[PDB]
Amino acid sequence: DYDLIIVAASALILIFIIMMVLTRAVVAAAVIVGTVVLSLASAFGLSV
Amino acid sequence: LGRIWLPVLIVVAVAAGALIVMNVRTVFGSNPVVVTEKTSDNAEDFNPKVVTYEIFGSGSSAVINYMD
């Protein structure tokens, strides 16, 4: 449980930083991260 | 702040991630042994009740059995 929380937080922050650096935009990076998270929830549901 | 907004936000995000790591990593474990509490009584001898046995008769000697 604790490792899942840590991994999710660290990965999200790092991916957000990388996307913000590359696209030079904040809202675009936020949109990318949020959409990926929603897809992640759907994936969990389908696999379960 | 065209050239200042990016590194500041990067540092802020890194600090937040580091804080979360430092907390959650140390949350795990921290319960290897269970130690029960001790509550004993004061073992002292104040005002002890005194019991006295007396045997006496017209005879010379006697055989005596008693419970301590």
Automatic annotation (TrEMBL), chain A:
Transmembrane segments: 4-22, 29-48
Localization in the cell: Cell membrane
Superkingdom of this protein's organism: Bacteria
Family listed: Belongs to the resistance-nodulation-cell division (RND) (TC 2.A.6) family. MmpL subfamily.
Stated name of the protein: MmpL5 protein
Organism of origin: Mycolicibacterium smegmatis (strain ATCC 700084 / mc(2)155) (Mycobacterium smegmatis)
TrEMBL record, chain B:
Range of the intact protein held here: 2 to 69 of 138
Cell compartment(s), UniProt: Cell membrane
Source organism (scientific name): Mycolicibacterium smegmatis (strain ATCC 700084 / mc(2)155) (Mycobacterium smegmatis)
The protein's name in its UniProt record: MmpS5 protein
Domain of life: Bacteria
Family per similarity comment: Belongs to the MmpS family.
